[PDB]
Amino acid sequence: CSGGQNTHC
Amino acid sequence: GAEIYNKDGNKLDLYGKIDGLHYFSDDKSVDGDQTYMRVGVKGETQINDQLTGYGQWEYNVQANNTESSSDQAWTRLAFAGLKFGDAGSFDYGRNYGVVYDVTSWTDVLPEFGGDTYGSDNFLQSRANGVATYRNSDFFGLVDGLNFALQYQGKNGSVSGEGATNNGRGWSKQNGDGFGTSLTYDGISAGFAYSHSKRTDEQNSVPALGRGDNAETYTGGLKYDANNIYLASQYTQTYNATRAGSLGFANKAQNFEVVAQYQFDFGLRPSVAYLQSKGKDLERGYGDQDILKYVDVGATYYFNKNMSTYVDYKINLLDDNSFTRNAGISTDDVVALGLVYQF
Amino acid sequence: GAEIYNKDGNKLDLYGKIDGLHYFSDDKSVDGDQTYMRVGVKGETQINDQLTGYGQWEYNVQANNTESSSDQAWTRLAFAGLKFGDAGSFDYGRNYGVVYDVTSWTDVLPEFGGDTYGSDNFLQSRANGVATYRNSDFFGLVDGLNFALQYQGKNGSVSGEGATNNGRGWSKQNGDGFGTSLTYDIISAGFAYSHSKRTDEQNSVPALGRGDNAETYTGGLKYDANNIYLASQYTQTYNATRAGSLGFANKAQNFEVVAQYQFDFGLRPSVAYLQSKGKDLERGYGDQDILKYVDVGATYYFNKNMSTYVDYKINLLDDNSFTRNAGISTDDVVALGLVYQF
Amino acid sequence: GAEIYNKDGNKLDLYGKIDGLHYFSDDKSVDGDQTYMRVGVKGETQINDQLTGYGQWEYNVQANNTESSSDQAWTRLAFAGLKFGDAGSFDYGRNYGVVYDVTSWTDVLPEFGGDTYGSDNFLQSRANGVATYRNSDFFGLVDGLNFALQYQGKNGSVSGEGATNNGRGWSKQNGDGFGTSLTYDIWDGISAGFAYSHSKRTDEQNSVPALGRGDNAETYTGGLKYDANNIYLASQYTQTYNATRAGSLGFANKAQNFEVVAQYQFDFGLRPSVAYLQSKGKDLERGYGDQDILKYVDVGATYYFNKNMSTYVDYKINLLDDNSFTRNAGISTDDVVALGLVYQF
């Protein structure tokens, strides 16, 4: 649910 | 990555990392332990002197919850493709969108950053059923110019008229779409453009965001030389940026810029700024800031296999009705990490 | 597979594939992306000159849905066993049924096929808690005769009178059962038989299917020579074939035939026909066709590690009350795939 | 395990097992197939002559349910850390509590055992967000003395005032806590250990369950072990305060756990084992008074074909008496028989 690299939430 | 097999013209590469991560925040939805790990495999076979086949799988496992919890592991990448020497390449599966080819230049922060867009959000990040054709050096016309096309099939609702086999909520649905990218050259310049149809569910269920098509224009710049990394990208989207949980923004203008310097002994301090402003929002919201914060942090590399980092996100958003309704966090976060990469 | 470890008489084999797959169909429940991958490990240890131990695990991961989806990975095979030289072998765990030993000769289609039976359906496919004894050359008697014995424990309801630790719905429950198989090379001929007890919940919850025992009789033929592959099998079942979601068929007859030819340059066209007729159904259904279609397709092998195929299923089922109530698809499907095998 | 890569000072070890397991019991909640497998990876890189980095991940997959089942796989261990020559080591992630350093001496049974404590139960077993500093030989001051500290971050509810990002039910929540352990080898074979932990209790743990009221969860453990001459003897005694689960009814105000195990290893590979386990609760609420939480005797044996394949049989003789407390708390009081066939790689 966030920009591809370090998933957030 | 670790090459664990190379015989008969076929090679297998195993890669991944284990991240011991902790968050310090006043937001109870993000504060606490955030341990996880990644694991994946990369393959490549030599069909003949001028044809090559390959495949890559990437899988994410969360390890910050109890053993009785649910939905802690998911797949990030899965695709197979062919390489026709220097005439280009083609692959199909779950892969990155062509917008990422430009927006990844600023996605180099230790823990935060790269969140003006989301995964499974049209062609801005990892998507499902994307067929990508990539050509290096633009056939033979020029040198150093990368080029790519992409096409994505419809991913409809769980059930109903617009359903497909892999249904999902309106936040991750899309219609037929396509995209192109173009990067040219330590200074590099990039441009990406995507265009997708919007499902009927996305136009009726959420309160914000009405339109027929989702479009994205991205321009990028990058400097990478003399242990200096400067990158910035500006993106203007149309009915394609999520306004939290309330829907989609009619118009958005994202701008993120990052500056890094790599020291001789392994320290890589970084400074970045990210913002995302929405326009023409319904329900009387008007123009609102979807994201705005300053990121300060540093990373230490013991070697290519072990590293540690600290990341400090200074949230500049102001709490108001829109942020509370859309569930957008407005609190500072501090992250501590210790990563083993294999 | 890729043998990644061989020391001290113990060898580890890592195998799997990544399948970029797309379906073209009018049925919204199957149309769309179908990308997935398989990963597994095969082991074998040399206990002594005439005793050998082994174990095999197989994992299926679906990569055609978003990162927040649920239940996208599951285990296909997991068992451990021993080999007593040439006196036979024994293994226990999640493994194939003995009926598969004969019904797999027609499961060679590119994408479709092998769907007259389902998984976790008594002893016809992969099952839980099966103890299998397999003997090659039939002790010391006639050569070329393969024999197998199997026993499966009870897998009951989630809770109640007939519960076990691993509960499940009535469509996958079973009682104590056993099965036998026998294949011979003369061109090959095979015969299989199974017999299982039916749980109380299976005899009360679903509308169709009443009986105490589940029966299965199977006979098959196979020709594999001179780049020609011919195979067929006929199966007669009693209270063992699922009539969609309505329950079980009192009597069912399954018939499959497949013809394939392998070209010298790598093309392998295939033609097949499958049918399954149910008899003596309750609710006044009478005799109904559970499955009937013609499969035409071809496969191209670049090498042993890379391949692509096209599969066309021509559905001959007629839409009626039974098909709609049981949720049986009656639409043609076209499949395109690009597989990397490691 | 199986070392599959060793180059540039970095080594990878792949390990796991496949267990074909069946249970025979009159309790319908445990009888049936219990097949599963484990897979994991252990890594280690040589940063320099006196600094070393490492990481380990362990993952559990259940294979005794249908392909459409849910929640059949979970992570057991995941941590990364550093080793500082001989000055000690530090690691963070999902790892064992320091109480396990002593209580694992009796966790050597074929299939059963080690059930006086649960997982994600404060610092007695595998937990989340544990920062563990381990020192061997006590800074080099005295040889053979192992030592360790631990700190654990709060793991609150799914939502509410005391929520965190990784929420959970009251049975696995906790506050900020710490623990220490200390094990020494008196001479060859004989060893002695001692552990202590202390954690804060969340608000839901003091309001939702019926049994167990208190501010802090404490645990005192002391164990003994003899391992020589193909003979294995071990025992551990534990006293807890508001830290032992009394079934699904909540927590026991006072609990005393005792486990003793005796094993012998034969020349040809047979390893018979005998053990006894008990867990007695005190001062329970709702008029329950003093009740037995766990009491059974375990008899079994193991046969090793080699270091990669083995089989075993385990018999658990349950001595618990059925009453109101056991039925209400859902504690099984039936005997169980287990058969296993394991391949390890």
Author numbering:
A (entry chain D): 0 to 8
B (entry chain C): 0 to 184, 188 to 344
C (entry chain A): 0 to 185, 189 to 344
D (entry chain B): 0 to 344
Kindly provide excerpts from the paper associated with this entry.
Bacterial conjugation mediates contact-dependent transfer of DNA from donor to recipient bacteria, thus facilitating the spread of virulence and resistance plasmids. TraN is an OM protein containing 22 conserved cysteine residues and is involved in the formation of mating aggregates during MPS2,17,18. In addition to resistance plasmids, mutations affecting the K. pneumoniae OM trimeric channel-forming porins OmpK35 and OmpK36 (homologues of OmpF and OmpC in E. coli, respectively) also contribute to reduced carbapenem susceptibility.
The structural basis of the TraN-OmpK36 interaction was assessed by cryo-electron microscopy (cryo-EM), which showed discrete TraN-OmpK36 complexes. However, TraN was mainly disordered and exhibited an occupancy of less than one molecule for each OmpK36 trimer. The additional density below OmpK36 was assigned to TraN and it extends into the channel of one subunit of the trimeric porin. TraN inserts into the OmpK36 pore from its extracellular side and reaches halfway through the channel to L3.
